[PDB]
């Protein structure tokens with residue numbers, strides 16, 4: 001199945017609708033698991049979804065990531081030289097050091113009380129006042145992430161830096177926004193490089209064993225220190241994605257407005273199980289990652305479709321999370337799907353549940369921050385569910401576009417907390 005011509009421009013016009021539009025234009029039936037091939041950025045790109053597509057995408061014998069993400073997105077979103085761009089043993093060494101920070105249960109346990117405290121502070125700010133879920137909980141997540149990582153700055157400086165991260169996250173995916181995103185990336189990289197250099201030179205003392213110390217000690221496969229700007233880029237890759245949970249928190253507020261019986265169950269629970277299941281089904285249901293790219297390292301073949309060395313293979317995330325072959329009633333928002341699961345580690349066993357990537361965290365490129373992200377999102381769900389939180393139901397607060405990346409309600413979701 002092929003779609004003719006170069007469809008690069010259609011990525012910007014279609015956003016999250018791009019993969020299902022191309023499968024339709026190719027003549028596939030709805031719910032087909034067949035790959036579809038088009039041209040993007042002057043080369044072939046084959047779009048795959050579902051369990052077999054996951055197995056292909058994460059097969060590092062045939063897939064590489066260097067050069068897969070277009071720089072206009074990647075250099076703004078994750079920065080130059082980031083772990084996302086690495087392959088092979090160098091990738092494994094860098095990823096081990098980053099997963100040691102984000103993915104270890106004891107470090108997650110350190111994050112949990114910090115994010116609960118910052119969420120509670122944001123929500124207290126809504127009392128008798130006009131709050132904004134996206135802006136205020138993204139800020140709360142960023143404050144928690146800096147405290148968690150051992151980045152110790154005056155409150156005004158932290159808020160300003162977290163604000164730059166929000167501006168970057170809110171703008172990197174559009175034609176109008178990309179100059180703003182690249183401006184913020186420049187300032188943040190200068191800031192993080194200066195901080196790493198200050199730690200390495202002894203001008204700033206980092207808490208022993210904190211994330212900041214470990215990023216200052218970041219080394220490559222030969223044992224040599226990574227340069228200071230790259231280390232600062234990796235420090236941002238362990239703090240900015242926590243800020244980005246604000247997108248899921250905005251959707252969670254929408255979902256709580258739309259699912260008042262689940263909201264009641266969360267408020268009446270003693271266990272946190274409903275809030276966890278609700279947070280997971282927010283990550284399954286709402287659009288965040290549209291798709292993600294890799295490049296073939298050698299000629300190969302996938303379900304009768306030839307895959308040429310150097311072409312892109314694009315895993316369609318929305319189409320996997322919403323595949324009727326992989327899920328029962330995928331268009332239904334239903335936290336019961338996850339009520340039998342107790343931890344994020346257990347949720348990893350669900351093969352098509354890939355909101356932050358698939359396969360294995362330490363041996364592949366899968367996100368190492370899902371435990372942090374579910375911790376932050378669950379804290380948000382529990383605080384947003386409380387009955388004194390009044391979530392706006394106006395159209396600009398509830399609806400979101402599928403044709404712009406990233407997606408969120410235009411207003412950010414307006415909220416207030418009832419007060420006496």
Ligand code: HEM
Nearest residue numbers: 083084102238241242244245356357365366367369372373
């Ligand atoms: C809104 C929340 C988040 C989303 C939607 C998200 C999504 C993703 C996705 C799609 C990938 C690429 C997976 C692949 O290449 O196959 C990824 C990788 C990564 N994420 Fe997350 N993430 C989030 C939160 C976090 C958090 C909280 C952290 C750390 C504290 C984090 C750190 C990373 C890192 C370091 C990588 C690169 C891993 C590698 O290439 O080996 N992310 N994330």
Ligand SMILES: CCCCCCCC/C=C\CCCCCCCC(=O)O
Nearest residue numbers: 040041070240241244289291292293
């Ligand atoms: C031709 C290449 C086609 C592939 C284009 C892929 C577009 C990907 C768009 C957005 C990726 C979102 C990644 C998740 C961001 C949140 C975590 C973070 O801050 O790093």
Ligand SMILES: [Cl-]
Nearest residue numbers: 326327328337
């Ligand atoms: Cl299911």
